[PDB]
From a paper:
In the first step of the HP, GFAT synthesizes d-glucosamine-6-phosphate (GlcN6P) from l-glutamine (l-Gln) and Frc6P, releasing l-glutamate (l-Glu). GFAT contains two domains: the glutaminase domain responsible for releasing ammonia in the hydrolysis of l-Gln to l-Glu and the isomerase/transferase domain, which catalyzes both the isomerization of Frc6P to d-glucose-6-phosphate (Glc6P) as well as the transfer of ammonia to Glc6P to produce GlcN6P. The active sites of the two domains are linked by an ammonia channel, which forms when GFAT engages with both of its substrates, l-Gln and Frc6P. The main distinctive feature between prokaryotic and eukaryotic GFAT is the feedback inhibition by the HP product UDP-GlcNAc, which inhibits the glutaminase function.
Having solved the structure of GFAT-1, we aimed to understand the mechanism of GFAT-1 activation through a single amino acid substitution (G451E) that elevated HP flux and extended lifespan in C. elegans. Positioned in an evolutionary conserved region of the isomerase domain, Gly451 is in close proximity to the UDP-GlcNAc-binding site, suggesting that the mutation might interfere with UDP-GlcNAc inhibition. Crystal structure analysis of GFAT-1 G451E revealed no major structural changes compared to wild type GFAT-1. Notably, Glu451 forms a new hydrogen bond to Gln307 of the interdomain linker in the mutant structure. Analysis of the kinetic properties of the G451E mutant revealed a comparable Km for l-Gln-hydrolysis but had a reduced kcat compared to the wild type enzyme. Very remarkably, however, GFAT-1 G451E showed a drastically reduced sensitivity to UDP-GlcNAc feedback inhibition. We conclude that GFAT-1 gain-of-function in the G451E variant results from a loss of regulation by UDP-GlcNAc-mediated feedback inhibition. In our mutants, we observed altered sensitivities to UDP-GlcNAc, which we interpret as follows: in the gain-of-function mutant G451E, which showed a reduced sensitivity to UDP-GlcNAc inhibition, the hydrogen bond between Glu451 and Gln307 stabilizes the linker and both residues might function as spacers between the interdomain linker and the UDP-GlcNAc-bound isomerase domain, preventing a close interaction.
Residue numbers in the entry:
A (entry chain B): 2 to 227, 241 to 293, 304 to 681
B (entry chain A): 2 to 227, 239 to 294, 301 to 681
The structure:
């Protein structure tokens, strides 16, 4: 899900300009949830904007942001020309994992039929049933089946039982969150507090961007405990200021790169255009606007596939020195020596990030000589896996917020393990709570299906392995071989992308099929699992990865002349065994597409359809052999008429159960 | 593929009775798969059986043993009433690897046009090319495209170039196997050594059954090296000569005649000369042991297939697995196979389970309870990948090797890899004297009885129970775990009756098979204790039904696979009453919200799930770490009934192996 709110303080904006900013903020967050959306703003058609802050209008609609954009427009009652010197608008795109994605269930949620209080919520309230029963007894009636509604009905209850006539907006939200359980990121708007916004979080990201032509009072907001001009953030000599609440930085970068990352239990509040935090820093983001733009590509997934030559270079920038063959990961400098004294590596992740661990398990075993265990986070938790003080636990997470991965992190910390975060989001929970970590530095990934995050994770884990063995005389040549591979890897990726058209032809031969089996072993077990997940996710074909050595133990019975098969046969030590699997498939009359080496003339001669990828070091080849499957999934999805960026039934980053 | 030979020594039999015995032997071996078969026996219709040993008749045929039995009872020249006081007959079923299925390529293979030597062979001679060229350069002409023929020709070369007039049959075979490379089980017969048999093996099972009404000379055969062959050296009936020997590659062909067997080992050369059995190599000996196997265990009975029998007899196989090991009187567990090792095992620091296919799934199904009760790290490895990666193994690892057959190559090579690293090795097997049970430090025979069906059914659930039993041993000194152990053992006590309860819903499973009859895919979703159930049920439905079933960890749905859900994709979800119940319900809501309409395997008493879902398979509640046995059985049956609806033969293996070398 995604949160966005726009607060213009003495920066006159028309209602049209305001609603455009909200929609434009949701579009930036749409990849976080696109089942439904809604906006909340001040209604009324009084030329004087001050007589309109007592009327809150809600426009919510099932579907993607484009459906809400059309609903906001061609509205007969709303006059879009009214100028607002001060105004607060809140918006929200929803990933509806439960129930119907109906307007009633979209946010903002309201406290009554006159919208005295509205709220937008990311997360889950683990005790909304108790609150609902309590609030129902006190006379409040509910209209939706969302846990968020109990938050709106509760901030009104706290207001209906306030001791003084001027209890601050912060005081009410404080009494609310004290009764809530679980995780939440909230933005409140009320008619009783016109133009005032309150943002708070507990286990869900929430940041505040600020723009103003004038100097700002400070760059380090002080926290308060239960509000003068040396305490709040505001413009000095004038009032003009613009604030931006958001659950993701992609919605704010276009307006400003000055954001305040809230923390758990921080209750931010904008009163009289002044931002104070109750109960710290003011940072400069390094993201650029072009990083979250399609550019000349028709989709984000295709851009992020084709930019992998550059993102791989960015992952290694400042860390790999090819002149002297040295590897330094700054984030591990104060911990690498103690990691070498540990006795086991555990890699914990979900989905494609788990596949990145499968893809590097072998070279990690080889270069560290430690046991390496790779776990799916959800199952890791279900089993209460044994963990010890001399374990090193890696947590692979592009977003750094995946719930199961984060819970795994806290589980391992409670048992005293050394924790390492491999993330692509600097201010994420996983990067904060780990003892040390590496930022894979791939740039923002907007496509729901991970592409560059996978290859950048792959590379990051290889660089770690290279550090772990840098004191072994016997492994110096192996390190050189690998680092030369990394130097040549970007150009070889380019060589693979130049086969786009050849892979598109193959896609036209498969797009009508129901299933496809993808087979590999060794270094390319991960390749066949990840290709199968990509094809599942964006084409909806029933693709399944099968370990090639396991064919003879049952699954080969599926194969006949009608079952599509893709096989990966590379030039490594498993080549002869892969040739046996291919022979078994052909004996069953399978007509497989084979991803093989350009020089593998024997395979190329005897197979009709081959994808000929260039050769690299065996422990880097998985990067090259997975990219044809990224592209095949892309082209299969287009032929079948689906949107590669917005696959059905899900969104990007699983931050809740 | 299947070897059987029958030697009656001063036990008179007619040619008819001898041939009936050979054919019956081959019938016990058909279940392994084959494309042809043949027999070898003495020809000639001389009323005196002694004048017929110089003539060897072969009857081979591409096709089934029934066709061979028809060929045998159709020879106008063979008089079946001749009585042999001494005779050796050999029989073979072939799964072709070198040469197309045909009469000439069938076994027995012969050394010349007069059948001076004949041999039957399980395996592959990897250097048959060099041997065929050498023999052809010495004037020996080949008629088949099989590697086996080089063995028959080679033994005649050793005979033609023998130094003394009385070089033993064993000496000739010793020199043959010195030149062979690869895997083989072999039985030889020759007109030059009438009534004598020689068997030998390298990397392929071979055993000898024995029966006599007279006392046998020993129950432990000493080994000889090239040590004379006298009455203190070999096995024989003491005061009289009468004795019968049964060579076989599988005890299933011996057990209806005798349960006294000698299992051979690599490079043993076993010979029957003058009715006496000796074993040569190039003090140690080979035991005559009693098999706890009965013919009824390898017969269908009143079931229409072995798959149905072995599924429906799981109440009895689970009981058999626990016999002598779980005391339900004082609630203790004792695995005798681990007596001299359990204390060393308890000092190790990690458990590794290594296996293939469904045996790997049994590791996945018991991983959590092993972690809980041992408190050690438990790693579950697919054997082939384990080998590809050169996985780190250490002297204080305990490595488990799960294998119904005890011969699976990758599992067996994983075993040898771990032994080289000094790990303590444990075999969980269902086959007496298999390679994995022999080469591990200690082991447990799951004692499910022989598995004749193509797919693992009872072997899986018996492996499950054996691993739970081991877990219970590992924590028997822990005060804090005594209530948990008692709960589990009470669950084991009730498990047979709860399996019967699941089986009594067979009609409900058939209705589900009707619904999925026309479907091409089905996703099977679960987590925790029932992750393995998803993987294992999906494998059975692939292997037996030939439809695209896939197991999917429920916690992974929102990470991609949920995109497959719509109103057309069939889904089976497992929702049991354990600690992941709420998370499983969450998965169900996620699927239903995207128009999925899953069938749910759930607890018998789970009222909420049953009312809010159309079709539910309701199984009885058990302890959480045993529920996987009950939740997988409906999927075994679903695989079975779907295959029957679609007209498939559940006892016919499909993939089997790969193509045949034509060269
Ligand atoms: O195409 C697949 C997705 O990329 C998905 O499987 C993702 O890998 C997981 O949801 C983990 O998310 P994080 O990488 O943010 O932890
Ligand atoms: O039903 C499937 C088969 O049983 C297959 O998965 C595999 O070949 C065995 O499970 C492993 O063989 P062993 O258990 O004999 O090692
Ligand atoms: N390789 C031999 C024997 C195969 C088997 O074990 O049946 C052949 O093809 O004749």
């Amino acid at each position: 899900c995604g949160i966005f709110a726009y607060l213009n303080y003495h920066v006159p904006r028309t209602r049209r300009e305001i609603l455009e900013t909200l929609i434009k903020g949701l579009q930036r967050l749409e990849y976080r949830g696109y089942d439904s959306a809604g906006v909340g703003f001040d209604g009324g058609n009084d030329k004087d904007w001050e007589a309109n802050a007592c009327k809150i209008q809600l426009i919510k609609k099932k579907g993607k942001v484009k459906a809400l954009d059309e609903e906001v427009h061609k509205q007969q009652d709303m006059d879009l020309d009214i100028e607002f010197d001060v105004h607060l608008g809140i918006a929200h795109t929803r990933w509806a994992t439960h129930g119907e994605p109906s307007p009633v269930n979209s946010h903002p949620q309201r406290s009554d039929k006159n919208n005295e209080f509205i709220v937008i919520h990311n997360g889950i309230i683990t005790n909304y049933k108790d609150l609902k029963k309590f609030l129902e007894s006190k006379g409040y009636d509910f209209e939706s089946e969302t846990d968020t509604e109990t938050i709106a009905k509760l901030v009104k209850y706290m207001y209906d039982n306030r001791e003084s006539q001027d209890t601050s907006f912060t005081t009410l939200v404080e009494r609310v969150i004290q009764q809530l359980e679980g995780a939440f990121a909230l933005v409140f708007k009320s008619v009783h507090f016109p133009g005032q916004a309150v943002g708070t979080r507990r286990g869900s990201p929430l940041l505040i961007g600020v723009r103003s032509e004038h100097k700002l009072s400070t760059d380090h907001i002080p926290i308060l405990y239960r509000v003068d001009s040396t305490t709040c953030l505001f413009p000095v000599e004038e009032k003009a200021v613009e604030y931006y609440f958001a659950s993701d930085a992609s919605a704010v970068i276009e307006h400003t790169n000055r954001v305040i990352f809230l923390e758990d239990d921080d209750v931010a509040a904008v009163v009289d255009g002044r931002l104070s935090i109750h109960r710290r820093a003011v940072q400069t983001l390094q993201m650029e606007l072009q990083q979250i733009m399609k550019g000349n590509f028709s989709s984000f997934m295709q851009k992020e596939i084709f930019e992998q030559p550059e993102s791989v270079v960015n992952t290694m920038r400042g860390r790999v020195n090819f002149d002297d063959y040295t590897v330094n990961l700054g984030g591990l400098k104060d911990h690498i020596k103690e990691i070498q004294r540990c006795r086991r590596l555990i890699l914990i992740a979900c989905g494609t990030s788990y596949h990145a661990g499968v893809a590097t398990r072998q070279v990690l075993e080889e270069l560290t000589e430690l046991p390496v265990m790779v776990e799916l986070a959800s199952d890791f938790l279900d089993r209460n896996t044994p963990v010890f003080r001399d374990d090193v636990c890696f947590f692979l997470s592009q977003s750094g917020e995946t719930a199961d991965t984060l819970m795994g992190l806290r589980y391992c910390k409670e048992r005293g393990a050394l924790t390492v975060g491999i993330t692509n989001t600097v201010e994420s929970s996983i990067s904060r709570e780990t003892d040390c970590g590496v930022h894979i530095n791939a740039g923002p990934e907007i496509g729901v299906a991970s592409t560059k995050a996978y290859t950048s994770q792959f590379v990051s884990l290889v660089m770690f392995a290279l550090m772990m063995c840098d004191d072994r005389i016997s492994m110096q040549e192996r390190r050189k071989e690998i680092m030369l591979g990394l130097k040549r890897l970007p150009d070889l990726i380019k060589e693979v992308l130049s086969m786009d058209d050849e892979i598109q032809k193959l896609a036209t031969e498969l797009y009508h099929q129901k299933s496809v089996l993808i087979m590999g072993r060794g270094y390319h077990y991960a390749t066949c699992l990840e290709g199968a997940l990509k094809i599942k996710e964006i084409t909806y074909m029933h693709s399944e990865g099968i370990l090639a050595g396991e064919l003879k133990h049952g699954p080969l019975a599926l194969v006949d002349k009608l079952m599509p098969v893709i096989m990966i046969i590379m030039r490594d030590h498993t080549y002869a065994k892969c040739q046996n699997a291919l022979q078994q498939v052909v004996a069953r009359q399978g007509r497989p597409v084979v991803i093989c080496d350009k020089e593998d003339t024997e395979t190329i001669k005897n197979t009709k359809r081959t994808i000929k990828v260039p050769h690299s070091v065996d422990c880097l080849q998985g990067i090259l052999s997975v990219i044809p499957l990224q592209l095949l999934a892309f082209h299969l999805a287009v032929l079948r008429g689906y949107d590669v960026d917005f696959p059905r039934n899900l969104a990007k980053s699983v931050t809740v159960e």
